[PDB]
Design a binder for this molecule. Sequence first.
Ligand SMILES: NC(=O)C1=CN([C@@H]2O[C@H](COP(=O)(O)OP(=O)(O)OC[C@H]3O[C@@H](n4cnc5c(N)ncnc54)[C@H](OP(=O)(O)O)[C@@H]3O)[C@@H](O)[C@H]2O)C=CC1
Ligand SMILES: CCCCCCCC/C=C/CCCCCCCC(=O)OC[C@H](O)CO
Ligand SMILES: CCCCCCCC/C=C/CCCCCCCC(=O)OC[C@H](O)CO
Ligand SMILES: CCCCCCCC/C=C\CCCCCCCC(=O)OC[C@H](O)CO
Ligand SMILES: CCCCCCCC/C=C\CCCCCCCC(=O)OC[C@H](O)CO
Length: 251
Amino acid sequence: PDFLYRWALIGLAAFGAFSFATLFFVPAPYGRHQRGGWGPTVPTRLAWIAQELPAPLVFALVFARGEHADRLVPLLLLGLWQLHYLQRTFVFPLLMRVGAKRTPLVTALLAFVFNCVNGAANAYAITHGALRHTEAWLADPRFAIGALLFLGGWALNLHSDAILRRLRAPGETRYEIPRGGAYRLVSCPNYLGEIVEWCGWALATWTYAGAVFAFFTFANLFPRALAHHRWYRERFPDYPRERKAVIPFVV
Ligand SMILES: NC(=O)C1=CN([C@@H]2O[C@H](COP(=O)(O)OP(=O)(O)OC[C@H]3O[C@@H](n4cnc5c(N)ncnc54)[C@H](OP(=O)(O)O)[C@@H]3O)[C@@H](O)[C@H]2O)C=CC1
Ligand SMILES: CCCCCCCC/C=C/CCCCCCCC(=O)OC[C@H](O)CO
Ligand SMILES: CCCCCCCC/C=C/CCCCCCCC(=O)OC[C@H](O)CO
Ligand SMILES: CCCCCCCC/C=C\CCCCCCCC(=O)OC[C@H](O)CO
Ligand SMILES: CCCCCCCC/C=C\CCCCCCCC(=O)OC[C@H](O)CO
């Protein structure tokens, strides 16, 4: 029960800290940063769907295994999770312009396993044990603000990935300078949105599992945004010098 939960959290935190350090130097080898020599590859679209599926599925499974699956605040938190992950699993990958037709299996296995552990941990902290997400929490500003940051970051992430989709007609592999929306300010507003999103999750849940996931998302996307930003500035002599990588007007 709680033994596995604490060990899952320790391992996720450890993995996030070590990922942060390494990703400042070597970006995760998918997308524009996919090189040779990363082992066997798999179809890119199937990898995205298969690797993300544990997050909505294992979360719902463990959620329902908790006594408090019938409580209002847990059910609102389930709504936020599934809003994200039904989009991440069954909208984003189906519409994406895939570029390279294959992607490294090792990266997709990491994501699959991460989502298994992270999905279970986050649901476990909500509906199991004592009810901490009472109706009093619904009247706590931390839940309200957290939920609004969740939805704001989610919305920005969705809007940002949609703009990217149209930079490629289906079947194309080209990269274009993204423009409009928040690209007016940062190279990776999709990453900005998702970072803010899971910070909002951490606030609304007030669980160690939510906090570790907000930390892990930052640990992973913040160095990736810097690598994307560096990539843009060397691929395009054209690229706006005023843009930051992730944080408007900062980095
Ligand atoms: N929570 C987390 O820790 C993580 C979650 N995510 C989320 O999942 C989503 C996918 O992330 P990720 O794939 O890294 O996002 P990217 O922005 O790197 O790529 C998303 C899609 O847009 C395409 N694309 C990106 N830039 C351009 C461009 N300049 N011109 C044309 N097409 C472009 C990519 O094609 P191509 O792949 O060929 O570059 C890909 O299909 C994001 O919303 C992200 O926040 C992903 C990683 C970690
Ligand atoms: C009370 C409500 C509870 C609901 C909780 C679970 C929600 C289930 C639905 C998930 C799909 C959401 C997807 C949001 C729309 C996707 C936006 C998008 O990507 O569209 C791009 C456009 O079609 C071209 O670029
Ligand atoms: C050199 C690498 C340093 C090691 C540390 C980095 C590990 C990569 C992140 C794993 C967590 C995944 C959790 C969130 C899912 C992200 C989706 C993804 O990872 O990309 C998949 C790929 O595009 C299609 O298979
Ligand atoms: C997909 C699911 C999306 C979920 C989106 C969640 C957004 C929550 C935002 C604000 C919370 C509302 C505050 C709740 C107000 C309760 C106040 C109260 O306790 O009632 C008044 C009392 O009767 C007088 O004494
Ligand atoms: C870009 C703007 C980002 C948005 C800015 C907001 C940042 C908030 C970050 C995390 C929420 C903090 C909550 C983390 C603490 C959760 C764990 C906890 O404290 O409760 C466990 C309890 O003590 C049983 O031991």
